[PDB]
Design a protein that fits this description.
part of a larger assembly; 3 chains; A alpha+beta (938); B alpha+beta (402); C mainly beta (144); A: 938 residues; alpha+beta; six-stranded mixed β-sheet; 22 helices; B: 16 helices; signaling protein; GTPase activating protein; coatomer
């Protein structure tokens, strides 16, 4: 293949949309659409600019390009590629054509994602759009003209290259610098233990690890949400730690969880570090000062050691928040990465059944537990788990899902605490056992025979991998084997964590497929109601694959899948043959298509009762006392989804729900330009305009494209006076501009009736839509509301009383008001409590700016009529009376016993502490209740 | 053990008058001792290349240890803020245990100044921009001079936790398979949960007469990790290496044999050590078929000689040990432990079943490296006579008992 | 270092050896004069004092923010533990009159402990600006 010398020329984006353009007339030997190497070289490595190998695709000029450009052989779009080339105009370059593409497919093409939410199915679609396309380093790509992306690494044959080619077998990896990160600080006895250099390990954690990682986050300009929670196991026995057997966990223990920082953006790192340091300084007083019922406090309790700590309980506490795939969407962040900070060296004594359950749970969800150890690297292979079997047999195993990093000439790698700290007094560790007394053999009758017999015998004598002994090393190939199979296709993990890879190159063997598997078969077909819209079998098929990628399936391509398919063409992206293989730890899905439209789906489905119940004590950010947790961290799990009904509803309903988000619009300040167009009149005009804008977003077929009042609800119900629907049904088109190639349909429920004192509710029920389109639709609605003096804000769908039993890291506090109206005789009346049972609590919430949420509540009622009440999205399953702040930052809830609930709105995210102090002050609550009585009388 | 601090002072770079001392405990200690800060003010606040480095320099009879810190941010005047927590020590000492403490103090104050602007706001003067220092210096000074430890809270979440640790010599790499370890302490009672599992396996086999290969085979351990664990135990000054006891060994008295005489409690320990608890059966075996006095033990210690093996020495003096009920192994071990005798190692330099290929390869590698008989016997797991027979089959060799 | 004021034990010396307190027996030989060692705090013991009414009771304070009260009849574990949880202790002193009241100074604060009231202090004297170094009871008044 000859090298073709050529000139250089630039052009603006107004004339062409491609990157590198050639002339097909000037190069007749090069077919269009072929991978063509570009290099400025004279067969020499001329410093750094002489070695610049850049790939592109052979594309011809345009009419304006041919009419304008005459002396330039190559027209390259200005910008990033011009800066990378660093060449002046009319420079002599060379052109080489490579007719083979599969040999030049790059192994790894990285992709960095910022400030937006991209699902794994969206990553699969983006990689489907990147088939047969050449990329270079630091190239700012795009996706639906709103999702940017920087390619920070291209790899081929173990070598980093500036430019590469993306093919079908290109293992493209998507990483996110906008991600939710959870830090679990493992508070043990060794956090205050000194290292051989002379530093306590928590001093390392707060002075060398967190400031450096925050500096690295700021340097890359990542926008994360950190979540820092303490993690304490407390030993309740008086037995010494030297008497503990290796392999057995602690029989008597209490486990604590102090959530220091909730879901908080990392731009508040000063406040994050201040809160972390304050809570770590206060945790000793919080835990080691127990309260005795005799009226005083006794300094009691002991932290468990690292080896005997509740490590698998901490990992299950971390995996509590990913059990439900259909939770609330963090529309600005992508990856859920958990980091465990420990003062140990990767040695943990664990229970066997709990280890099995932890492995089975971690193989069924998208987390990478990156353990970081503040001690030096030990002499054994890390991470090391010691457990005792049913026959009290010690074993050693290294888990695949845990990766150990160490934070930092001979270095002491073995820890002897009693000799480093000199904890044993010199007179009491004097050697007791000495050399033996030269015992005989009872076969020796001579001293020379004894010497000869002494001189003759003087020189005599799938979630874990079982290590034979920690004192013998492993081979290089075995140490290369230690990596998870679901993450086999991957400082960079700390700063820019990676999502679950779209592909996996592993599969069960032929004997294992017939050993512990059961077979379920589907047959799903197009329905005539959905083909009125632009819906073939293909886009429905890739919507099903989008749902599978959302749940956690990876598309199997490799050797074992090919060798097991022929024992009856494998595919990775999307003709009529679409044979994909999707696998999780629970079930394996084989999906095949045809020209008829029928999609054949075969499900190969594959412990929780042999683990004791475990309810720890959880302290959130706004609590002052340790309270019992509302969820079992071990026994909650990622349930096997009912895929038959999923395929039925994507084809076209108890115990089933999709992705969902409730939206609350609230009255706020009016802009001054709006007044030049009653504040209540312009606010209801803005509400009507928003309703009209929603009803103008109705998704239409291709065939067709060719009450206000004030007061309680029951008063208005009986004023205008069986099922009365309070909401309307509507199926909107999320994307009207047609950016995506699929159907983006969502279901909208809006309130039929409205009060200025009642919150207005917008519902969004979507299954397979792109979340960025939902996010920009919500932004457009928020701008429309803010133009008319409203404020659209995003709120949890589930009730506030249910958040601890789902998300244990969320803040949640118990509010017990000081002045009880039903007990204190200063404010007591039979008529007032008969007319309004919760009058004082409602007035207290209203005086602090808390709007009411549940208008259909039966705790603030006066009469009952309309037996059956229902919303258009279903029945209101609300236990208490929820309240929303007018700023929408915090959520309140009023019970039947007068006790309040209180929790912030972390999805959207001073006043919270003000309201907590107001509820817990005699003077403020007395003044508020006196004002309430004065308003009641007058 | 640890040198007391001479003067602690906190120097900051003022944007108007340059580098200056803000607070200093003891008060006017530098001027009373003739230490002028303006002489070395360009080392306390140097250019940012020298900053964030452990700087220690000598000024007369005093050694001045500092960790200069410079933070570049537009919030401060002149686009940077510089401070230095400076420690003064005498010259004739070792400031090595104090250097990590000063380095970590500087790094922690760098973190605090970068986080919440502590030291810049502590001046209470709005010229540095666009909790007591003196009490902290007093507490650091007196706690490190009286306790070698401190816990001084400076905020609601921040405290100065400094502990001064001694510096230990690194272990040697000369430990090998033929060396036997002697535990100088009772290692069973030191074992807590933080010990290495390999070391925990090694502990019940350090009896003073087992080789490292024998301990590795007994504990099912790789010899390299046993070597590293013995090195770590050497690093904490608790295990001393020795030799395998054989009757083919050659022992000779050392230069410290008079310490058996010039010590009031060595000979009594020898009497209580070398004797069998009862009338042992070894004290009834023939050569072929009260406690012993200290003069007898000394005469037995002298009678060892170079080139004379322990078999010949024991068969020349066997009535003495039989009548006095003396264990010869315990006698040799006490002699080696008090450094009054030494072993002359045997070196087989050059000019029966069929031996294996790997066995002959490691035998040839041991011969070509001039290794001792002990190392070859350990590596082949064979006695001395089989190794000697194989070597005589392979060639002619001479033995040096050095 | 602190001499035991018990008339029946004039051979006892309590001395701090970093994080452990060493009781010396002078009737024993100089090679091995240590009788028993108190293994309490994790950091260095700062001050030790004996109860004047009951000379077999010893209170130790340390840098690790803990005040442990020991009994010399059972010198293995302390029979009373209390802490300030914020600042390192500087001294501990007993009351000469009331034989179960002891006070400790932790930085700028002075906490008075009652031996029957657990870790909750009887009072917290907080009038000092800088760090309190020394504390001392009155031999004649109960509460000075």
């Amino acid at each position: 293949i000859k090298a073709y010398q050529a000139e250089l020329g630039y052009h603006e984006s107004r004339f062409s949309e491609n990157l590198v353009m050639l002339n097909l007339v000037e190069f007749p030997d090069i077919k269009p659409g072929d991978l063509v190497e570009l290099k400025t070289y004279h067969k020499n490595p001329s410093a750094s600019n002489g070695d610049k190998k850049i790939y592109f695709i052979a594309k011809d000029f345009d009419g304006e390009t041919k009419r304008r450009a005459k002396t330039s052989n190559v027209s390259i779009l200005s910008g990033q590629l011009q800066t990378l080339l660093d060449l002046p105009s009319r420079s002599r370059i060379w052109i080489k054509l490579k007719p083979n593409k599969f040999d030049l497919q790059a192994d790894v093409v990285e992709f960095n994602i910022k400030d937006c939410l991209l699902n794994r199915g969206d990553m699969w679609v983006l990689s489907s759009k990147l088939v047969d396309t050449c990329v270079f380093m630091d190239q700012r790509l795009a996706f639906l003209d709103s999702i940017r992306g920087t390619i920070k690494g291209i790899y081929r044959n173990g070598k980093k290259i500036v430019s590469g080619y993306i093919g079908e077998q290109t293992r493209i990896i998507f990483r996110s610098e906008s991600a939710r990160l959870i830090f679990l600080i493992q508070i043990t006895d060794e956090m205050w233990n000194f290292e051989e250099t002379g530093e306590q390990l928590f001093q390392k954690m707060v002075n060398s690890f967190f400031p450096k990682i925050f500096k690295k986050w700021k340097d890359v300009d990542t926008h994360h949400t950190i979540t820092i929670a303490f993690a304490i196991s407390m030993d309740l026995s008086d037995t010494s730690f030297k008497d503990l057997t290796p392999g057995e966990s602690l029989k008597n223990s209490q486990d604590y969880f102090r959530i220091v920082v909730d879901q908080v953006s990392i731009i508040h790192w000063v406040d994050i570090m201040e809160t972390l340091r304050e809570e770590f300084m206060e945790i000793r007083k919080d835990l080691l000062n127990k309260q005795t019922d005799k009226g005083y406090s006794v300094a009691n309790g002991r932290f468990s050691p690292v080896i005997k700590s509740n490590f698998l309980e901490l990992v299950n506490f971390a995996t509590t928040i990913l059990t439900d795939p259909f939770k609330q969407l963090d529309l600005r962040h992508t990856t859920t990465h958990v980091m465990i900070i420990s003062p140990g060296s990767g040695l943990f004594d664990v229970d066997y059944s709990l280890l099995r359950l932890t492995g089975k749970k971690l193989l069924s969800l998208e987390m990478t537990m990156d353990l970081i150890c503040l001690s030096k690297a030990p002499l054994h292979i890390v991470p090391l788990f010691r457990y005792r079997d049913f026959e009290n047999k010690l074993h050693h195993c290294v888990p695949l899902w845990l990766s150990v990093f160490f934070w930092n000439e001979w270095t002491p790698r073995c820890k002897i605490y009693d000799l480093q700290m000199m904890g044993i007094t010199e007179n009491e560790l004097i050697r007791e056992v000495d050399v033996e007394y030269l015992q005989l053999n009872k076969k020796v009758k001579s001293l020379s025979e004894f010497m000869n017999d002494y001189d003759k015998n003087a020189f005599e004598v799938e979630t874990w991998v079982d290590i034979k002994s920690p004192s013998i090393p492993v081979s290089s190939e075995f140490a290369n084997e230690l990596l998870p199979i679901r993450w086999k296709d991957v400082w960079r993990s700390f700063t820019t964590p990676a999502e679950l890879p779209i592909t996996i190159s592993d599969f069960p063997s032929k004997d294992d497929f017939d050993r512990n598997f059961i077979f379920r078969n589907h047959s799903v077909t197009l329905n005539t109601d959905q083909e009125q819209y632009n819906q073939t079998y293909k886009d429905l098929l890739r919507d099903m694959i989008y749902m599978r990628l959302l749940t956690g399936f990876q598309i199997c391509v490799g050797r074992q899948v090919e060798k097991i398919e022929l024992s009856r063409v494998v595919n990775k992206y999307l003709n009529d043959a679409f044979k994909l293989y999707l696998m999780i730890d629970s079930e394996i899905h084989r999906i095949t298509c045809s020209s008829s439209g029928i999609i054949d789906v075969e499900r190969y489905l594959r412990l929780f009762d042999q683990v004791p119940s475990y309810i720890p004590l959880v302290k959130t950010r706004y609590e002052s006392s340790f309270r019992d947790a509302m969820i079992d961290p071990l026994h909650v799990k990622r349930e096997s989804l009912n895929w038959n009904q999923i395929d039925q509803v994507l084809a076209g309903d108890r115990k089933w729900h999709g992705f969902r988000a409730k939206y609350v619009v609230l009255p706020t300040d009016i802009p001054p330009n709006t007044y030049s167009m009653n504040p209540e009149e312009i606010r209801v005009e803005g509400l009507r305009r928003l309703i009209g804008s929603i009803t103008r977003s109705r998704l239409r077929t291709e065939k067709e494209k060719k009450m206000f009042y004030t007061g309680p609800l029951y008063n208005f119900i009986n004023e205008q006076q069986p099922i009365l629907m309070l909401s309307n049904s509507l199926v909107i088109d999320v994307d009207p501009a047609g950016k995506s190639s699929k159907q983006e349909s969502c279901t909208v429920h809006y309130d039929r009736v409205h009060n200025p004192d009642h919150c207005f509710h917008i519902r969004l029920e979507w299954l397979t839509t792109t979340p960025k389109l939902i996010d920009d639709l919500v932004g457009n609605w928020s701008r429309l509301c803010e133009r008319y003096g409203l404020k659209m804000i995003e709120i949890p769908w589930e009730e506030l009383c249910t958040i601890p039993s789902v998300n244990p890291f969320h803040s949640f506090v118990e509010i017990k008001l000081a002045i009880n109206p039903w007990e204190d005789p200063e404010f007591k009346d039979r008529e007032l409590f008969a007319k309004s049972k919760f009058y004082y609590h409602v007035y207290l919430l209203k005086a602090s700016g808390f709007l009411l949420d549940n208008r259909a509540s039966k705790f603030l009622q006066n009469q009952d009529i309309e037996f059956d009440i229902m919303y258009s999205w279903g029945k209101p399953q609300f236990k208490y009376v929820q309240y929303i702040h007018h700023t929408g930052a915090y959520v309140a809830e009023l019970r039947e016993n007068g006790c309040l609930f209180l929790a912030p709105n972390n999805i959207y995210i001073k006043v919270i502490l003000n309201f907590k102090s107001t509820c817990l002050d005699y003077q403020k609550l007395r003044s508020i209740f006196l004002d309430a009585k004065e308003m009641w009388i007058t | 053990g640890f040198v007391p601090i001479h003067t602690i002072f906190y120097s900051v770079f003022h944007p108007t008058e340059g580098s200056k001392i803000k607070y200093e405990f003891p008060p006017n200690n530098l001027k009373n001792h003739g230490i002028n800060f303006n002489t070395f003010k360009n080392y306390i606040i140097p250019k940012p290349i020298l900053c964030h480095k452990l700087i220690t320099f000598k000024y007369g009879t005093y050694r001045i240890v500092c960790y200069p810190v410079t933070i570049n941010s537009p919030i401060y005047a002149r686009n940077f803020f510089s401070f230095n927590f400076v420690f003064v020590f005498p010259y004739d000492c070792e400031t090595s245990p104090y250097e990590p403490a000063i380095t970590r103090l500087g790094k922690m104050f760098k973190v605090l100044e970068e986080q919440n602007q502590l030291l810049s706001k502590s001046e209470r003067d709005p010229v540095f921009f666009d909790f007591s220092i003196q009490d902290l210096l007093m507490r650091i000074f007196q706690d490190l001079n009286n306790y070698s430890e401190c816990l001084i809270p400076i905020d609601e979440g921040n405290a100065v936790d400094i502990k001064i640790f001694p510096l230990l010599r690194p272990p040697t790499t000369c430990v090998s398979l033929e060396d036997v370890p002697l535990s100088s302490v009772n290692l069973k009672k030191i074992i807590d949960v933080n010990w290495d599992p390999t070391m925990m396996s090694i502990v019940p086999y350090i009896d003073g007469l087992n080789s490292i290969a024998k301990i590795s085979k007994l504990s099912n351990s790789d010899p390299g990790l046993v070597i590293e664990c013995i090195r770590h135990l050497i690093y904490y000054k608790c295990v001393t290496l020795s030799d395998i006891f054989q009757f083919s060994n050659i022992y000779a008295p050392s230069s410290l044999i008079r310490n058996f005489l010039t010590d009031p409690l060595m000979a009594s320990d020898c009497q209580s050590y070398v004797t069998f608890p009862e009338v042992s059966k070894i004290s009834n075996l023939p050569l072929n078929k009260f406690l012993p006095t200290r003069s007898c033990l000394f005469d037995l210690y002298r009678s060892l000689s170079q080139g004379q093996t322990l078999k010949t020495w024991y068969e020349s003096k066997y009535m003495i040990l039989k009548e006095n009920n003396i264990d010869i192994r315990r006698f040799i071990t006490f002699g080696l432990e008090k450094r009054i005798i030494y072993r002359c190692y045997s070196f087989p330099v050059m000019i029966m079943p069929k031996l294996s290929d790997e066995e002959e390869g490691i035998l040839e590698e041991s011969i070509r490296n001039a290794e001792t008989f002990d190392k070859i016997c350990v590596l082949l797991s064979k006695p001395k006579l089989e190794v000697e027979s194989y070597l005589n089959e392979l060639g002619e060799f001479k033995v040096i008992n050095s | 270092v602190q001499w035991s004021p018990h008339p029946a034990k004039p051979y006892w010396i309590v001395s701090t050896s970093n994080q452990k307190a060493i009781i010396w027996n002078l009737a024993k030989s100089s090679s091995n004069a240590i009788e028993f060692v108190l293994h309490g705090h994790s950091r260095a013991i700062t001050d030790i004092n004996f109860n004047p009414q009951h000379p077999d009771v010893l209170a130790t304070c340390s840098v690790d923010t803990y005040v442990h009260a020991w009994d010399m009849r059972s010198p293995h574990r302390p029979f009373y533990s209390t802490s300030s949880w914020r600042s390192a202790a500087s001294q501990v002193k007993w009351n000469y009159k009331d034989p179960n009241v002891l006070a400790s100074s932790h930085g700028n604060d002075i906490f008075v402990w009652d031996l029957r009231k657990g870790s909750t202090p009887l009072c917290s004297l907080k009038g000092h600006v800088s760090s309190v170094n020394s504390i001392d009871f009155n031999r004649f008044k109960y509460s000075e």
